[PDB]
Amino acid sequence: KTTLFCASDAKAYEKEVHNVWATHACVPTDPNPQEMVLANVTENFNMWKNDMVEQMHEDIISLWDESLKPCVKLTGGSAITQACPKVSFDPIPLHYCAPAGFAILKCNNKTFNGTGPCRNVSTVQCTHGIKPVVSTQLLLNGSLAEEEIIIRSENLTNNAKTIIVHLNESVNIVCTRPNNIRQAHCNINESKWNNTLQKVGEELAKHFPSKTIKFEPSSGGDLEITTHSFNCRGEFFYCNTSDLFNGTYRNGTYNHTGRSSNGTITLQCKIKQIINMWQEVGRAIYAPPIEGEITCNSNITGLLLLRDDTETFRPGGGDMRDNWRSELYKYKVVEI
Amino acid sequence: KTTLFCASDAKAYEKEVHNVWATHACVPTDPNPQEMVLANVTENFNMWKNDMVEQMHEDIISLWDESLKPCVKLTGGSAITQACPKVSFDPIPLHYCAPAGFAILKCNNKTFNGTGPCRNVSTVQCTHGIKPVVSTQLLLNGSLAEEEIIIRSENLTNNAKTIIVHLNESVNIVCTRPNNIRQAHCNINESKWNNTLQKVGEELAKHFPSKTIKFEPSSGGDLEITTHSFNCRGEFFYCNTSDLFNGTYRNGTYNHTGRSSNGTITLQCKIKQIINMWQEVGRAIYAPPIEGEITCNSNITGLLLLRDDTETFRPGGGDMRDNWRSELYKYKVVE
Numbered sequence: 001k002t003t004l005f006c007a008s009d010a011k012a013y014e015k016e017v018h019n020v021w022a023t024h025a026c027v028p029t030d031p032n033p034q035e036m037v038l039a040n041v042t043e044n045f046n047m048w049k050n051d052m053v054e055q056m057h058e059d060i061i062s063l064w065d066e067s068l069k070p071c072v073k074l075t076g077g078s079a080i081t082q083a084c085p086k087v088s089f090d091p092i093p094l095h096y097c098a099p100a101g102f103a104i105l106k107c108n109n110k111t112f113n114g115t116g117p118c119r120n121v122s123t124v125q126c127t128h129g130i131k132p133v134v135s136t137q138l139l140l141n142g143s144l145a146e147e148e149i150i151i152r153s154e155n156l157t158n159n160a161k162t163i164i165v166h167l168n169e170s171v172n173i174v175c176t177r178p179n180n181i182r183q184a185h186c187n188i189n190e191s192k193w194n195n196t197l198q199k200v201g202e203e204l205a206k207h208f209p210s211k212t213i214k215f216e217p218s219s220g221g222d223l224e225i226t227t228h229s230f231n232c233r234g235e236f237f238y239c240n241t242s243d244l245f246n247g248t249y250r251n252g253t254y255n256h257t258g259r260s261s262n263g264t265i266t267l268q269c270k271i272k273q274i275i276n277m278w279q280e281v282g283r284a285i286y287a288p289p290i291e292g293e294i295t296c297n298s299n300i301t302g303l304l305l306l307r308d309d310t311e312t313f314r315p316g317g318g319d320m321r322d323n324w325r326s327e328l329y330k331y332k333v334v335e336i
Numbered sequence: 337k338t339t340l341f342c343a344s345d346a347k348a349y350e351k352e353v354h355n356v357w358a359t360h361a362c363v364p365t366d367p368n369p370q371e372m373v374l375a376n377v378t379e380n381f382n383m384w385k386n387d388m389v390e391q392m393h394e395d396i397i398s399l400w401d402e403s404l405k406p407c408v409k410l411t412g413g414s415a416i417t418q419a420c421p422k423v424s425f426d427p428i429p430l431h432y433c434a435p436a437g438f439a440i441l442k443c444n445n446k447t448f449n450g451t452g453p454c455r456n457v458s459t460v461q462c463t464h465g466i467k468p469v470v471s472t473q474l475l476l477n478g479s480l481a482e483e484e485i486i487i488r489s490e491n492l493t494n495n496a497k498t499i500i501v502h503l504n505e506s507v508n509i510v511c512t513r514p515n516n517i518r519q520a521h522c523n524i525n526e527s528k529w530n531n532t533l534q535k536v537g538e539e540l541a542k543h544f545p546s547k548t549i550k551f552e553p554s555s556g557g558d559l560e561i562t563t564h565s566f567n568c569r570g571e572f573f574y575c576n577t578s579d580l581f582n583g584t585y586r587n588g589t590y591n592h593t594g595r596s597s598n599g600t601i602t603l604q605c606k607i608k609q610i611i612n613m614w615q616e617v618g619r620a621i622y623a624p625p626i627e628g629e630i631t632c633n634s635n636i637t638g639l640l641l642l643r644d645d646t647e648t649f650r651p652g653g654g655d656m657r658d659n660w661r662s663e664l665y666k667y668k669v670v671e
């Protein structure tokens with residue numbers, strides 16, 4: 001336990017809300033941090049029980065609270081109104097650093113699954129640059145696994161626990177609302193996606209021995225988790241993924257059963273004004289979408305899954321603490 | 337044409353020289369940016385013939401003249417000496433704005449090459465925030481193409497003319513003189529560089545039917561142009577790029593023949609005191625480098641190339657007006 005502090009390359013002249021936030025909350029990053037490599041030592045990590053995740057969660061909640069002010073905030077029977085101006089929105093990498101008297105241990109084992117023993121260890125003052133990207137089903141613009149795809153879970157035999165898939169090669173996704181003003185769409189190359197779900201398919205095949213491994217859409221619930229929901233330029237995008245998570249892996253080969261056109265999977269997206277908040281239990285209401293072309297070009301670097309003869313996996317999400325876990329898995333706050 | 341005026345978020349209690357200059361030379365940026373989108377309006381652009389570049393160049397010359405004072409300045413055979421204190425140096429974004437009666441037309445075509453027809457244009461009072469980064473070969477801390485790498489030249493078939501490559505994704509470069517006090521070095525991830533040079537190689541392959549596209553170092557000349565020269569915290573870095581611009585593109589793929597060690601290209605750099613000035617024809621001598629760790633973490637946002645079966649390309653630069661053109665290419669002053 002300690003109280004971490006943040007570092008970033010935020011610009012004071014930038015009116016983008018992440019830059020404003022980091023300027024009023026963080027410290028100038030050090031242009032050349034140097035890692036103290038600890039060989040010979042073997043310590044244990046648990047990405048699922050990490051306070052760094054809670055601190056970061058708190059910080060991102062405060063950030064959204066001060067940056068994205070909704071027209072309405074409804075909780076129970078009480079509603080709160082205030083000015084909801086359109087803003088400049090684009091996440092910047094956040095570093096989390098330990099104060100004097102504390103250190104940050106970093107796992108260098110490159111196939112480490114987040115829980116248990118890690119042996120190539122090291123000492124850093126601050127973490128790597130982390131973009132606080134809030135999304136569901138798909139993890140966007142994070143860091144890639146440097147070798148094979150990695151499966152992360154608090155308990156894999158417990159189907160109620162969220163599975164994090166760390167990809168080794170990103171899959172580009174391009175969402176856009178062209179110049180219906182709430183109708184948007186995402187484009188994904190079907191080849192990269194087929195390859196990706198092939199690799200993820202076999203990596204899941206290893207953990208679940210002789211099963212037909214299917215990928216199906218989210219069963220139901222709030223649109224935030226039943227769709228790939230995310231924030232693009234201050235606008236809340238909800239993108240249908242029924243043609244994305246639609247496949248079958250069996251006997252060492254994968255088959256995409258989702259619809260595609262000319263080698264491209266297109267997600268039908270909707271920009272919503274009424275959102276179910278991730279910070280707290282309640283609803284937030286924002287202004288109609290801005291004018292012009294609203295496009296986000298992102299990289300899919302991770303998956304969020306939930307497991308149900310056959311093993312079926314569906315896209316998950318909703319708890320952003322897992323989104324922070326996908327990047328904070330290699331770190332651990334330590335005493336000196 | 338007119339007499340433009342600058343606007344910035346420059347800050348009067350900052351002793352950083354860009355701020356010191358901008359506070360007394362510029363105007364508070366304006367909380368009210370109002371863009372005027374236009375339908376049915378072609379205007380023709382020529383980034384290579386834009387006076388805004390000349391004005392910018394001139395007051396960047398003024399800025400440097402008042403900020404970075406060399407111990408000696410030799411021009412025309414005449415030597416001028418003065419105090420050469422080490423200062424705080426870090427570029428800030430400058431906006432260029434049109435006075436009363438004038439406006440700045442802005443191209444919105446995301447793939448506009450600087451020259452020729454542009455349709456989707458708006459009207460602004462001031463340009464975007466531009467950091468006056470003086471450099472050769474590599475363009476640092478600039479804007480990225482909103483996507484698709486862009487090739488710029490007033491005539492590509494004219495080998496004598498500087499090519500500006502506008503990148504869509506930045507390539508981080510970390511230069512450092514560690515705590516020989518003139519020996520420095522730069523670090524660049526090789527993967528991002530081979531990626532960049534491959535895509536650039538193919539967008540070059542488009543303009544050049546299909547010859548073998550080679551990347552070779554600068555043939556010769558002053559160190560300022562034969563190396564990636566730039567200023568970091570007041571100190572003049574000259575970094576070798578013989579292992580950066582050295583590779584071959586053939587077969588629709590590129591392979592790097594430049595040398596590397598475990599995924600990291602390291603440029604051998606030298607902090608120099610005697611400098612061939614970019615402001616004018618002459619030389620300036622400064623004081624020895626400051627003590628401590630001298631590090632700059634920059635982003636490569638563009639390239640400056642020169643073209644010689646095979647088309648050979650080499651890093652170029654020297655004329656900083658080209659460094660202003662890569663950012664001012666989309667704007668034009670009108671009445």
Ligand SMILES: CNCc1ccc2c(c1)[C@H](NC(=O)C(=O)Nc1ccc(Cl)c(F)c1)[C@@H](CNC(=N)N)C2
Nearest residue numbers: 134135136224229230231276277278280281282318
């Ligand atoms: C199986 N997991 C179910 C679960 C588990 C935990 C939580 C949720 C769902 C709820 N998450 C969210 O509403 C949420 O992320 N919205 C959201 C908003 C904007 C963007 Cl861009 C976005 F990508 C997502 C949240 C509770 N809130 C309410 N019940 N109203 C916390």
Ligand SMILES: CNCc1ccc2c(c1)[C@H](NC(=O)C(=O)Nc1ccc(Cl)c(F)c1)[C@@H](CNC(=N)N)C2
Nearest residue numbers: 471472560565566567612613614616617618654655
């Ligand atoms: C093919 N183009 C050749 C060309 C064309 C025009 C010009 C040059 C070269 C000369 N540029 C420079 O000396 C120059 O940029 N130095 C410089 C200083 C500091 C930093 Cl940080 C830096 F990155 C560069 C300059 C003439 N001056 C002298 N010959 N003394 C103008």
